Design a protein around this nucleic acid. Structure first.
Ligand code: DZ4
Ligand code: MG
Ligand code: MG
Length: 430
DNA sequence: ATTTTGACGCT
């Protein structure tokens, strides 16, 4: 009752760019705009692997991971943009730079946590309070929320058969219900949050050309879930009160961190399917099956409560370069391994030097990882060494030194290598 | 022959 926390202390948003790499390429090449389009890496093997897909192309069934030749079978007029290739490998520089454009705009509004190349969490609690002070008891107009969905609404009793009609009906129900004169109301706080996110999304689109979606809720997991509910080019507010119905038919795997083995174990061990069913277990029961930390997290999360903070971190903490060498292309000679380590080290040097100039920091550890043919794990082996100079020849030599004894017998390398990976870590200020 | 990443947990 009066002491049961409800996880309504924060306003958190998650902003995720729509078909991000595709929009970067469509901005660059107007011929690709408003077309079924995908971004592909490499080309020789089955036309290249698709890594991003426009919504027009998704309507034909094109998905990430599809070979371009196969996507063309579903969508004969599919247009393609290729990732830059440098030193024999895919180069993602253009997308990292476009990401910085977006993150720098978002950081004008609030502290952000860069969660991936095209998404960031925003802690809006302070900004909402300031905005509530600015507009004392002044009602919030639907005009301030032109792209917002209120999850769960409309409810109860032709304008109801088009999606914009439904969107506005739900928004009207929500705003009609609001208590505008209490500045401590969580639902009001979320609504002001959504007004700010509309402003943020408009700024991103104005200043970059890129569209995005967003979720606004009281924590990162609900914000992330909300964001996906009405992609693309829309934002969704998930209130605390919307959680029971939302979670009552929500597959466990849809919640952040439960899409893999742990989520599968929750389903198998407890014999449930939906996130809401978790409420019927005690905290101790969940801790007994999934550990103290996971158990406590699940117990709170199924009630819509999560405390993971929006970390103040706009820049990646590691800078890595990797290449797979699948099937017959697996690396089988010492010279091959050394040449590709050099290629990777040269890209890494270029990125590290730019990073040192832009961000006043230096990496101090080099992690070298390899995969051997047959091992299904991403990494078969990981070894580190000191990273003392931004020099590609030195980094490649040091990586070879730290992995060379993985070679059962050689001039020859065995078993063949299916992946090389260099990652610069442990940054210190410079 | 899905590729190239990046954050974080466990021991
Ligand atoms: N498995 C993968 N391998 C490589 N790159 C990938 C990837 N998954 C995504 N990317 C790259 C390419 C993606 O453009 C970018 C962002 O990933 P999303 O936010 O998950 N997907 P997007 O923004 O395209 O569409 P949506 O509107 O549904 O958000 O990261
Ligand atoms: Mg995206
Ligand atoms: Mg994303």
């Amino acid at each position: 009752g009066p002491h049961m926390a409800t996880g309504q202390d924060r306003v958190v948003a998650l902003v995720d760019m729509d078909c991000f790499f595709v929009q970067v390429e469509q901005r660059q090449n107007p011929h690709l705009r408003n077309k079924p389009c995908a971004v592909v890496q490499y080309k020789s093997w089955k036309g290249g692997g698709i890594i991003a897909v426009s919504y027009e192309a998704r309507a034909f069934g094109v998905t990430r991971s599809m070979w371009a030749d196969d996507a063309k079978k579903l969508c004969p007029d599919l247009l393609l943009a290729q990732v830059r290739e440098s030193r024999g490998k895919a180069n993602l520089t253009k997308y990292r730079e476009a990401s910085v454009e977006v993150m720098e705009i978002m950081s004008r509004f609030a502290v952000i946590e860069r969660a991936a190349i095209d998404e960031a969490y925003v802690d809006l609690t302070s900004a909402v309070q300031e905005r509530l002070q600015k507009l004392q008891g002044q009602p919030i107009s639907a005009d301030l929320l032109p792209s917002t969905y209120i999850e769960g609404l409309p409810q109860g009793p032709e304008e109801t058969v088009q999606k914009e009609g439904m969107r506005k009906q739900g928004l009207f129900q929500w705003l009609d219900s609001l208590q505008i004169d209490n500045l401590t109301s969580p639902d009001l706080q979320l609504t002001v949050g959504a007004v700010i996110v509309e402003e943020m999304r408009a700024a991103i689109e104005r200043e970059t050309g890129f569209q995005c979606s967003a979720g606004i809720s009281h924590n990162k997991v609900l914000a992330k879930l909300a964001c996906g509910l009405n992609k693309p080019n829309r934002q969704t507010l998930v209130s605390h009160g919307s959680v029971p119905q939302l979670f009552s038919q929500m597959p466990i795997r849809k919640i952040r961190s439960l899409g893999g083995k742990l989520g599968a174990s929750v389903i198998e061990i407890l014999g449930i399917e939906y996130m809401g069913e978790l409420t019927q277990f005690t905290e101790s029961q969940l801790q007994s099956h999934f550990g103290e930390k996971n158990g406590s997290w699940l117990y709170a999360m199924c009630r819509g409560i999560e405390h993971d903070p929006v970390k103040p971190r706009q820049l990646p903490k590691t800078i890595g370069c990797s290449k797979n060498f699948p099937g017959k292309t697996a690396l089988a000679t010492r010279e091959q391994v050394q040449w590709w380590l050099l290629q990777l080290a040269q890209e890494l040097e270029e990125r590290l030097t730019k990073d040192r100039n832009d961000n006043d920091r230096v990496a101090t550890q080099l992690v070298v990882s390899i995969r051997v043919q047959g091992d299904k794990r991403l990494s078969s082996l990981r070894r580190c060494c000191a990273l003392t100079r931004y020099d590609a020849h030195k980094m490649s030599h040091d990586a070879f030194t730290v992995i060379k004894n993985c070679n059962t017998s050689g001039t020859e390398w065995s078993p063949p290598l299916t992946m090389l990976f260099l990652c610069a870590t442990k940054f210190s200020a410079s």
